[PDB]
Design goal:
The structure is cut from a larger assembly and holds three copies of chain A.
Chain A: E1 4-8, H1 10-28, E2 37-40, E3 48-50, H2 53-59, H3 65-85, H4 89-108, H5 113-133, H6 141-151, H7 156-168, E4 175-176, E5 186-190, E6 192-195, E7 213-222, H8 230-242, E8 247-251, H9 258-266, E9 273-277, H10 283-296, E10 319-326, E11 331-334, H11 340-354, H12 362-374, E12 377-381, H13 387-409, E13 412-414, H14 418-421, H15 435-445, H16 450-459, H17 463-472, E14 477-480, E15 485-488, H18 489-492, E16 495-497, H19 498-517, E17 518-524
Parallel strand pairs in A: 4-12, 7-8, 8-9
Antiparallel strand pairs in A: 1-17, 2-3, 5-12, 6-11, 7-10, 10-11, 13-16, 14-15
Helix pairs in contact in A: 1-2, 1-3, 1-4, 3-4, 3-13, 3-19, 4-15, 4-19, 5-15, 5-19, 6-7, 6-13, 11-12, 16-17
Bound molecules: adenosine-5'-diphosphate (3 copies) and magnesium ion (3 copies).
One adenosine-5'-diphosphate (ADP) binds at residues 31-33, 35, 53, 87-91, 150, 153, 415-417, 451, 455, 480-482, 494, 496 of chain B.
PDB class: chaperone
Keywords: mitochondrial, C7-symmetry, chaperone
Entry title: ADP-bound human mitochondrial Hsp60 single ring complex (C7)
Chain lengths: 526, 526, 526
Amino acid sequence: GSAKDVKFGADARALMLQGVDLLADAVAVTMGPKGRTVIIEQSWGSPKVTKDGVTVAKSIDLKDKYKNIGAKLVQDVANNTNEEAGDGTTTATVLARSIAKEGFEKISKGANPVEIRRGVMLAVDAVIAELKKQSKPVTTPEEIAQVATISANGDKEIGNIISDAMKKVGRKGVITVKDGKTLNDELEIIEGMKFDRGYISPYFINTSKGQKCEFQDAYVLLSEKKISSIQSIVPALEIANAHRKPLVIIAEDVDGEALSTLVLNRLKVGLQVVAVKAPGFGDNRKNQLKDMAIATGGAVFGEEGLTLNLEDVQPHDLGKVGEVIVTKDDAMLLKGKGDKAQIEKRIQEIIEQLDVTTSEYEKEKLNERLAKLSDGVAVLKVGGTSDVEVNEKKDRVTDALNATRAAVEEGIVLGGGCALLRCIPALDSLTPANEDQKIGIEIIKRTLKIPAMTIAKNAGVEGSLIVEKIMQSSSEVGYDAMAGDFVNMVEKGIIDPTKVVRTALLDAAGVASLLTTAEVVVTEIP
Amino acid sequence: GSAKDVKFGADARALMLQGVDLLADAVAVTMGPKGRTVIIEQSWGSPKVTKDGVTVAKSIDLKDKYKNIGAKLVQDVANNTNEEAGDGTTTATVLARSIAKEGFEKISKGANPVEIRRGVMLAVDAVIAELKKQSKPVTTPEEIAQVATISANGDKEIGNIISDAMKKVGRKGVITVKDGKTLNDELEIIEGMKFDRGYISPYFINTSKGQKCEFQDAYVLLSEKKISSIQSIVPALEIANAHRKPLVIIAEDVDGEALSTLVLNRLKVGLQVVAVKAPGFGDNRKNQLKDMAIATGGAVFGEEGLTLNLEDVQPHDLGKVGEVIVTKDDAMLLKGKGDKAQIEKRIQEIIEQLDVTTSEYEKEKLNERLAKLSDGVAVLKVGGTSDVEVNEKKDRVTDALNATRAAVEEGIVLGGGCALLRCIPALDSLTPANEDQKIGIEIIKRTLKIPAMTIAKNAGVEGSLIVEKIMQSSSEVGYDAMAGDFVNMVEKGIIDPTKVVRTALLDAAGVASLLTTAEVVVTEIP
Amino acid sequence: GSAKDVKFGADARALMLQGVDLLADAVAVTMGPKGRTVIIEQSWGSPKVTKDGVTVAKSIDLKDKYKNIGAKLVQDVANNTNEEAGDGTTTATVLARSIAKEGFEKISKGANPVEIRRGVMLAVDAVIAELKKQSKPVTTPEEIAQVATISANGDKEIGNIISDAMKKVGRKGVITVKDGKTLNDELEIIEGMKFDRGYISPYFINTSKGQKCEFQDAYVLLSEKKISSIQSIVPALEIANAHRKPLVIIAEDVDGEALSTLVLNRLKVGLQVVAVKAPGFGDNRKNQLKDMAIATGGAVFGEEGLTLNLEDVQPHDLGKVGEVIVTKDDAMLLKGKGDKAQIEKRIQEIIEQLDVTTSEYEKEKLNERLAKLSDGVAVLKVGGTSDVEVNEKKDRVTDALNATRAAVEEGIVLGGGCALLRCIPALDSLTPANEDQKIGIEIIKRTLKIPAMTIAKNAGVEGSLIVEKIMQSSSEVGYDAMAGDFVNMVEKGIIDPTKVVRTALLDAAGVASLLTTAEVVVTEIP
Ligand SMILES: Nc1ncnc2c1ncn2[C@@H]1O[C@H](COP(=O)(O)OP(=O)(O)O)[C@@H](O)[C@H]1O
Ligand SMILES: Nc1ncnc2c1ncn2[C@@H]1O[C@H](COP(=O)(O)OP(=O)(O)O)[C@@H](O)[C@H]1O
Ligand SMILES: Nc1ncnc2c1ncn2[C@@H]1O[C@H](COP(=O)(O)OP(=O)(O)O)[C@@H](O)[C@H]1O
Ligand SMILES: [Mg+2]
Ligand SMILES: [Mg+2]
Ligand SMILES: [Mg+2]
């Protein structure tokens, strides 16, 4: 209904590129360990002085509609990189601006956007392949500490606490980060579990910050079979309502009818309940549900042998947990105080079954169940002096933990933009179909130098000469910005996960192609 | 009572054509499988990046009143093409603009708009005749999948689910699409019925999105005869009100008084009851109501042998259904739970009557009742992560259903704009009355290369040479845009319903004539 | 969401420097004993005539965003100097402007900001080393009076009261400053204690002026162990809310659970409670809690001998104090009227144990234990003629207290600006790495005479010749400005703590580097 202003072709692409140029100029100065300083004017108090690319990026909002939406496009892409891999906002932004500007200048000469995009994406796939083949896995906790410290903007405390948590629980363990009311960060191992199923309907989310649902002292309903009837879930809801506690139900599949009833009941004020799918696809589902029932304390409803009907639900027949955190893909049941003697008996039964037989596939499940029932949940409470400080530190710790998980899962590569510099040689092997694909290959190859050049420039040195030396030098040493010398990157501690570099290059190429190939831009009149 | 600005003749037609030019220029870049990108500025969040022409068209609102109303004219015509055949908004828009601009240029030279319109519609009707001539009837489910997948803008999931639904239920079966709470689309066959009658009065509509009326757990009053007395419908409404369920009545004809009473009680807060014309007119009217009474459950009021008066209405004699969704022309009664033993007995009676005699006109009715009581209603539940996403997905799959129906109702025809490229030869057999009808026929034959040229242009190639090759080549191969090569069109699966092309050409010609012949344009003073 | 203006490099640093120049010019005139006069327009009464630089600084807000944020940066840095040392807002401001202007003029010639900052930091470190090298401690109450009078801008009465309070209590004793209704400042010694542990959660703060929590007639709960259960803190809270009196609890560590419960109880209107950590690291903690229990009157809950479970708390079993002041690192319990006979018995026991054996590390602790109970809190009640001039005078007395504590903590140096003048020979021994670090050394050595020059200029004389005479003169005399002659600076009275000079130089150098090395400045559009 609102009157629009419509711009076509390069007329709109130029303005969008101006917006992305302002964004990338603002966020480029903050890149590296020697990142420059940005002062953001606060409308209520003292100005905010930061060297963080995420804050600088989320800070700017342009007045021009076209510039603002180009900046918003690149900015949301960088946010996606940050939220997916824990790092890469500034790198994705500088790569995106490089690719977009080079593509715009090549297209304005009269080239084909589609062929250039094809060449750019073939180059990107080659680079990602080489960067994956050059990755190395983490083998020692010191590498975990290095990765966490780099991902936390050089914060040694965050790296140390994350490495300690991964030492206590495991590299593939369960670590969570909540707020703390004290003045120093504290590491706590508490009893809890986490399994690879998320909420069926995204309508129970209590918290909009991280697409989570947080509950305190929530009842656990277990039903290994489908809900028999409405008169079988209604008594459980009545019991939960009368017992002043929320409900967390886990079953096979609650999609069509009971899910609709729960969603419509969610609209009621004061009614809280979530649904999660059962963890496994066979005997693992049954034994994991038995483990959860033992750890929570209660009874299992719907068993083939016991034939316990959901209609005859009792307060003592449901599980109990302290804190519930359910996400889109994973669900966390925290502080489940069940029968300790029963938990010990179940542990004894599991360890007795461990030394019975091995099949190379079910023994992995048995070891996993032992780990879930034995290894606690690492909680990293974040302390500070005010709400803003605890929030910012919580975000930094969460992002560092995400980047550490990414390093564990895939591996690590040389930091400081050196990983993308060792990916240049493989662009010689590939051959383009036409001249525009070769133009895209050139665009990408003059782009992998941008992160290292930016980091060196922020260090104060003339980054062109440094990257020339880096390319001339061997494949194990690179340029350090803290010390200002070419050092062996791998053991100096300057390493980042393969995932962040992959995601940054992919996101940058995607948004740059979108910026250089968008034909019509529709904006509301100012 | 508000001051108007009035413009006359070409002075207003020029401005309206400027508006339609901006609309068609913005929506023309998103045409084909290779369609360019429109960045639509959202006022509250990130910009909306889309390649879908219906969204681009919905986005555009001009500031100039005359340009805006020209854009709105072509926009609503394209919307009617969409809502009538589920596909053809961008083609209708580009042909609209082509014909309108060509006729405007031929009329500014001093031609007669009436003679040009006559020639244009002569040409259009010839093209529609040849396009009916070249249609082919779908004969295999893979063609249904191809049609659904094209009509869904290349979504393979929509094509696959629609083909599975039309394999489970049938090509001319009952398929409905409803929202869903889960994260994936699930196909479900649910017991229901649908007949070819719609609500009598368009005042009971609960849903404004689609001229529909949705109910849950509704009563079904049946009276094969007419309502004898008002004291014969007041007790039924009293029972409905006291039994907390919305009545749904089906009589012969309710127009004069009972319908007026129902409409005046509709304005009461919380009163819900709809009337539906009796389904049949002969013996089918006599037996389909028995079928519905057996399905829902209860008794039939007004029989010629049972004399069951409507005054003695009882809660055990009315029908029951789960969902009632009635449209202007058709009505669906979903989840009618009745005596399954009675339904089995009715099916046994029908299959016994099947092998009794054959009349070549009543066997069809027998098999139709067999299918209505046997083939369940396919419901395609649509799930996602946000109300806007589930609404977009619902609209896309609904349009794909409409286009598949349009394909299985009249046939298919070569896609990619080649359908309108093999209708050009027909324009040489006709002969105009005067020179201006020849002018209009030239306009139309020039307009018939515009869809193929637009698709090729969006693919990155020079569409004129491609359409020259298509007209020089044989009558079975056309130009692909995903693979960028001349390929036999029918085998790969580039086919669209002949109805969408027919409707697009008719709609485009109508709005173009209305734009090049309107003489006075009255607009509110800004 | 707010649109921003983003400025880069010198095109922003220049405007920020203009802001800091306006701020420093306005606050520089008020520097010294002979400080000039500033009239500040009061928008409700008569203008405010002041010679005090903190009011002038806090009085200045520029209309331009970039200038205002440069001014605000230097303002907050000067405020930090004033709030962590009690004196040095104007000296820090003038040094900061000097360093920033000189760095800006050297960088605009083409220098490297990183290297200039490195030279500046090495120069500042050398200067601070020599400042620590030339500091002398306080040896008589006369010097306490001198430093208090200088830190109160010449007020002989503030110096006198602070010196008398330090004579009565001690140079390392508890002195506090509250408001009062009389017309003349009065000194009172009252019973109370203070220990080096502050609050655990910064959410109980009733006072927002000085991050304090102020209570009147508050109950004291003691527990030298972890809270047994919620079923033992609930009765405590019930007792506290039944006897119409707040609670002050001291424990071992209340961070995770009970702290969260006290914070959520802090969110209800009518509930007040604070928590403090245990005072000691061993036997000192136990005996200090014993002393506090005797001084407050009641019982100790949680001993290994008495085993007084926290589930049997009674009103006679809790301690009582008059006024409670809790800060971030310190806690004060004031007017705790316990059993005077029990306090005398405790004092007799302590003085009897003070003659058994000494160990050179626990006799000190015994002295401290006796002093906590024996030395009374010195409260300096401030009063006058209205509400605003009691806040003003209380701020002045508090800042003078802070500077006297800084003097009795590290030492004193030659006032007037000669302290920074005697540190000039330091900068002749250090050697720079390159020419830009020599530029930084020159900047700092030229900056080291700005305060003396400013004080002399405000006196009425050409300060360049005065500082030349001071540098040519012996290392014990310097220019007086209340007399106008070069006098022996040490026995005349003109001395300031080394901590104010050190903090001012650090703060000036830090904000000046920030100002001359900030690359991007983001402000909202006006
Ligand atoms: N000591 C160091 N020397 C060189 N490069 C470093 C050093 N520490 C971190 N880096 C590099 O800094 C880059 C990330 O920093 P920054 O740009 O602030 O964050 P982001 O990952 O959001 O872009 C990484 O590429 C990393 O390799
Ligand atoms: N692979 C393909 N090659 C060539 N044309 C295609 C292909 N897929 C779809 N098309 C054509 O695209 C046209 C429809 O696309 P589009 O313009 O987005 O929708 P609309 O039907 O609303 O105009 C149809 O004419 C169809 O024939
Ligand atoms: N009689 C005096 N002669 C010379 N200098 C003095 C005298 N009294 C105070 N000063 C100097 O004045 C300076 C502090 O005054 P002022 O600038 O008003 O406060 P601030 O410490 O906030 O800058 C100190 O450096 C001190 O040495
Ligand atoms: Mg980072
Ligand atoms: Mg389509
Ligand atoms: Mg002072």
